[PDB]
C-alpha cells in the first residue's frame, strides 16, 4: 500500500496500517484515530490460599501467636489457682473453645461466661472467614519484553516459540530493537494471522506477537476466552493507524480536522463498540508440620 501511494497510484490509503519511522519519511500521515501498538498474546487459564496470610491478616504474626500467648497466660493462672500437669492440661482449655467441635472440655463462675464469649468470637471469626472466602473467588506472566524468556528463549529445556507475520511493522520493530531475537523469530514465521492464532490455540506456539488492535480483537473473539493479551499497560511502543497520504497533498489539512471532530463528538466509541485444591494441600502440609512440632514439644515436656 505504501508503494502504491508513493508511485502516485493512489491519493489516500486507509488499511489499518500503523505509523512507523520509515513510513512517515516517504508519505504523510494524518492524526491517529485509534490507539494500537505491539502486544503479546498468551493462553488464559480457589487458587489463592484461604485461612492464611494472603487470605487475611497479611502481618500473620500477631494473630497466630495470640492463641499461644493466651494459652500461656491460661497455664500461668491455672498454676496460680492453687490456693496433674498444669502446663500439659490448661492448654486444652483454650484449644477446646477455639472451635465448636471439641468434646474434651472440662470447665468446672463468670469465667464460664468469658470462655463462652471467646467461643462466640471464634465462631464469628470462622463465619466471617467463610463469607470472605465465598466472595474471594472472582479472578499474565510475560510482563513485557523485558522478561528473560524473550531474551533467552532457549534457556529453559522446552524452547519458547514466538510468532510474527512478515510484510509488516512488527518485524521491523524487532529487527531495530532486538536483532538476535528477530533472527530467532524468523525461523517461526507464519504466513497469516489465522494460522498463528490456531497454532496458539492448539499449543504449538507459546506466545504470538502482532499488532495490539488485531490481537485484542482476536482475544475478544476467541472461543472460551482462552487467549488473552499481556495484562494492561505492558504494551510496546504505542502508535496509531491514521490514513496514508502523499506528501504535499492539500487534503490532509482538512482530514485531520475531520478526524479530530469525529473523535471529539463521540463518533469513535460507538464504532469501537460496534466493530470490537492447592490451598487444602498446603493446609494439610502445615498441619503435619504443626503435628510434628507438637510431638517434639510433648517429648520435651
Amino acid at each position: 500500500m505504501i508503494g502504491e501511494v508513493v508511485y502516485q497510484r493512489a491519493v489516500m490509503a486507509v488499511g489499518s496500517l500503523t505509523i512507523n519511522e520509515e513510513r512517515s519519511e516517504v508519505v504523510d500521515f494524518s492524526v491517529p484515530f485509534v490507539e494500537t501498538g505491539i502486544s503479546v498474546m498468551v493462553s488464559r487459564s480457589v487458587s489463592p490460599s484461604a485461612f492464611l496470610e494472603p487470605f487475611s491478616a497479611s502481618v500473620w504474626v500477631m494473630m497466630f501467636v495470640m492463641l499461644l500467648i493466651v494459652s500461656a497466660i491460661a497455664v500461668f493462672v491455672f498454676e496460680y489457682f492453687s490456693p496433674s500437669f498444669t502446663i500439659g492440661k490448661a492448654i486444652w482449655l483454650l484449644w477446646g473453645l477455639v472451635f465448636n467441635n471439641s468434646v474434651p472440655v472440662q470447665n468446672p463462675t463468670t469465667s464460664k461466661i468469658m470462655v463462652s464469649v471467646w467461643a462466640f468470637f471464634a465462631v464469628i471469626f470462622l463465619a466471617s472467614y467463610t463469607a470472605n472466602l465465598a466472595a474471594f473467588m472472582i479472578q499474565d506472566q510475560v510482563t513485557g519484553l523485558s522478561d528473560k524468556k524473550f531474551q533467552r528463549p532457549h534457556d529453559y529445556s522446552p524452547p519458547f516459540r514466538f510468532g510474527t507475520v512478515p510484510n509488516g511493522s512488527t518485524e521491523r520493530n524487532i529487527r531495530n530493537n532486538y536483532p538476535y531475537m528477530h533472527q530467532y523469530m524468523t525461523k517461526f514465521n507464519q504466513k497469516g494471522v489465522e494460522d498463528a492464532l490456531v497454532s496458539l490455540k492448539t499449543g504449538k506456539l507459546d506466545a504470538f506477537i502482532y499488532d495490539a488492535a488485531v490481537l485484542n480483537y482476536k482475544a475478544g473473539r476467541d472461543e472460551g476466552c482462552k487467549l488473552v493479551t499481556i495484562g494492561s499497560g505492558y504494551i510496546f511502543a504505542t502508535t496509531g493507524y491514521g490514513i496514508a497520504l502523499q506528501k504535499g497533498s492539500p487534503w490532509k489539512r482538512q482530514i485531520d480536522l475531520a478526524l479530530l471532530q469525529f473523535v471529539g463528538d463521540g463518533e469513535m466509541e460507538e464504532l469501537e463498540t460496534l466493530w470490537l485444591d492447592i490451598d487444602n494441600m498446603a493446609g494439610v502440609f502445615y498441619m503435619l508440620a504443626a503435628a510434628m512440632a507438637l510431638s517434639l514439644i510433648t517429648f520435651i515436656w
Binding site: 512517515s24 477446646g96 464460664k112 470462655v115 463462652s116 464469649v117 467461643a119 471469626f125 531495530n176
Partner: protein, 218 residues
C-alpha cells in the same frame, strides 16, 4: 447457677456444664443448633455486601448524567475536557452545575477531592492514574472516553514539524518513551480491634473474677 451456665454453654459452644429434664435438654439442643446455623448463614449473607458506593463505570451512569446537590462533580477550568463537553450537546443539565465548581489548577482540584470537597473530578487518565498510584486514598473510575494524545504544539510557520514528528517516532521505536514512563509514571482495624479487645478482656477477667470469688469465699 449451674443450669444457666449449661444453657449458655449450649447457646455459646464452649463446653460449659428426670424424663422432663432430658426431653427439655433435647429440645433445647435441637433449637440451639438450628439457631446457630441460621445465625451463621445470616452473618455470611450480611458480610457479602458492597458497603461503599458502586464505582463509576463511565459517562453512561445516570448518577453522573443527572446532577444533584448530594453529588457534585466538575472539571478544573476551560481545558480540553471543557471543549469536549461543549462540543457534545447532551449533558447541559450537568454542565450547569459543572460551571459552578471550577478550580484554578488541576492540583488544587485534586487536593479538594482528597479533602472530600468534590465527590468526583473529571480529568486526563494519565494524571489521575499517577495520582492514584502515588496517593492510595484516591482511585480512578471509568474505562475510557474522549481518547486522544499528547502532542508538541507548534505554530504553522515552524519548518521543523516533520523533524519533530520523525524524532518522536524514533524515540518511540527506540523505547525512550517506555523508559521515561517507567522512571516517572510507573511508581509503586475492626478485625484486629475485636480480637485485641476480647484477648484483653479474657486475660483481665481470668484474674479479676478469680480474686473476686476468693474474696467472697474468704
Amino acid at each position: 447457677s449451674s443450669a444457666m451456665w449449661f444453657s449458655w454453654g449450649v447457646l455459646l459452644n464452649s463446653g460449659i456444664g428426670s424424663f422432663s429434664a432430658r426431653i427439655l435438654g433435647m429440645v433445647w439442643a435441637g433449637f440451639a443448633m438450628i439457631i446457630v446455623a441460621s445465625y451463621t448463614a445470616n452473618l455470611a449473607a450480611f458480610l457479602v455486601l458492597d458497603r461503599p458506593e458502586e464505582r463509576i463505570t463511565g459517562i453512561n451512569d445516570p448518577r453522573l448524567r443527572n446532577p444533584s446537590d448530594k453529588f457534585i462533580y466538575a472539571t478544573v477550568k476551560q481545558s480540553s475536557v471543557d471543549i469536549y463537553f461543549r462540543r457534545q450537546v447532551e449533558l447541559s443539565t450537568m454542565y450547569r452545575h459543572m460551571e459552578k465548581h471550577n478550580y484554578e489548577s488541576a492540583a488544587e482540584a485534586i487536593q479538594a477531592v482528597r479533602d472530600n470537597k468534590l465527590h468526583a473530578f473529571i480529568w486526563d487518565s494519565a494524571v489521575l492514574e499517577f495520582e492514584a498510584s502515588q496517593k492510595c486514598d484516591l482511585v480512578t473510575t471509568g474505562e475510557l472516553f474522549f481518547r486522544s494524545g499528547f502532542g508538541i504544539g507548534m505554530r504553522k510557520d515552524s519548518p521543523w514539524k516533520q523533524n519533530v514528528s520523525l524524532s518522536i517516532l524514533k524515540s518511540h521505536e527506540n523505547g525512550f518513551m517506555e523508559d521515561l514512563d517507567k522512571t516517572w509514571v510507573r511508581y509503586q482495624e475492626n478485625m484486629a480491634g475485636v480480637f485485641m479487645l476480647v484477648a484483653g478482656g479474657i486475660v483481665a477477667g481470668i484474674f479479676l473474677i478469680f480474686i473476686e470469688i476468693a474474696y467472697k469465699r474468704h
